[PDB]
Design a protein around this ligand. Structure first.
Ligand SMILES: CN[C@@H]1CCCN(c2cccnn2)C1
Length: 166
């Protein structure tokens, strides 16, 4: 069936106050079918609040829209983000990797979510032994947002716990 609607929405911040439901839709329809598209406005003045949201038919369409950033909508670069599960960060904690998980295990898996800048496999300050967790830093927050909404992460045969970090 259909992916949950929450996972198909993009919050668009930084809109030009002249962007309308129609111009936001015409822009974002380039990357998929939009089932919803709304500019948020003041209830009394009708003046734009400078943000809005679009809902795609599928998660792959959300991905396509995010991969097409930066988006310049009505002359202004906007800020799309997936809906809250916003804690906008570029780093994840990866736990449950035990002592046999290496850098290449984490890189080969996580590189398909985004461009990796740092992998830090955590070791004991006294003994140097691996502690069984790591941090991965990406160049952009959407990688992290995709990662943390998955129910499961399997890396090196381990079922891992993944959370946003700082
Ligand atoms: C072994 N438990 C670790 C130690 C410190 C890192 N940590 C987290 C968890 C979520 C986000 N950032 N860091 C928990």
């Amino acid at each position: 069936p259909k992916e949950p609607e929450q996972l198909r929405k993009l919050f668009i911040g930084g809109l030009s106050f002249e962007t309308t439901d129609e111009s936001l839709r015409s822009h974002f329809e380039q990357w998929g079918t939009l089932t919803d598209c709304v500019v948020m406005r003041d209830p009394n003045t009708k003046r734009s609040r400078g943000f809005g949201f679009v809902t795609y038919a599928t998660v792959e369409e959300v991905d396509a829209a995010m991969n097409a950033r930066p988006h310049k909508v009505d002359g202004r670069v906007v800020e799309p983000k997936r809906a809250v599960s916003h804690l906008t960060v570029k780093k994840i904690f990866v736990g449950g990797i035990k002592e046999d998980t290496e850098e290449h295990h984490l890189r080969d898996y996580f590189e398909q979510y985004g461009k990796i800048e740092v992998i830090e496999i955590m070791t004991d300050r006294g003994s140097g032994k691996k502690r069984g967790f790591a941090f991965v830093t990406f160049d952009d927050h959407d990688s992290v947002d995709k990662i943390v909404i998955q129910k499961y992460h399997t890396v090196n045969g381990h079922n891992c716990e993944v959370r946003k970090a700082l």
